[PDB]
Amino acid sequence: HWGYGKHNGPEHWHKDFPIAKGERQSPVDIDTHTAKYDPSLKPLSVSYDQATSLRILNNGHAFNVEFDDSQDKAVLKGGPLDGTYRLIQFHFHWGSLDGQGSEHTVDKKKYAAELHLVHWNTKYGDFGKAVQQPDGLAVLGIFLKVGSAKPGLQKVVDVLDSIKTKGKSADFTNFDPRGLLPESLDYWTYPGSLTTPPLLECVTWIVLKEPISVSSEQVLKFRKLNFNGEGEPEELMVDNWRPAQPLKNRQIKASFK
């Protein structure tokens, strides 16, 4: 199956998922100088006050916190979006070293990790239908830089022991995702795809300008996860990120100057 190793990594994906060579693939490098400031861009509206977290799980690719998306409990509106998008889950991509880990880069600069809050367009009924549409998903990308500890991230860090290997999960209720947002909601936006197979081109990427900082020990705990299931040879979960793809016939718009 696909993964991030030499034999099943990104450079092999196209064989099983041809869309990997598509026209709007992610991530991409955000070139601040050629990004077009757009005044008609509305401010972002993240309403996560009623968010209901359910569980956290290691899926062999990354760890994911799933939310109850049965109702409009945590939605994203505004920005370049037309419609309400529901939060279904969030996950991270991180590196084996502090200078790599994020998927999107800024002027070729890589961050230690990158948080993706995944939302789907409610006008489509369910996530399954949303992934069949060019505007089916909206992923909020947030960069993580090493520095001071991020208090809202510690709850996730503590529970990682219980989900060390692929297939493990644990109840993770009452988690407030607002604890992971930076102060400013300024962003960049462009049409892209999922960064892992099936690599579907249904995503409106909203990448925040301002990164959040997390301590080295917090990201350290991320690296102690396992790609493998229990009983198999241990393989540390690190560098679960895909390299930048060519922008092609696309323009990155900024909501700020």
Ligand SMILES: COc1cccc(N2CCc3cc(S(N)(=O)=O)sc3S2(=O)=O)c1
């Ligand atoms: C039909 O397509 C499906 C069905 C079920 C699951 C998925 N996903 C897994 C891959 C993947 C990669 C994401 S990233 N890094 O681009 O945010 S979000 C995401 S997903 O929605 O959780 C996709």
Ligand SMILES: [Hg+2]
């Ligand atoms: Hg799509």
Ligand SMILES: [Zn+2]
């Ligand atoms: Zn992701």
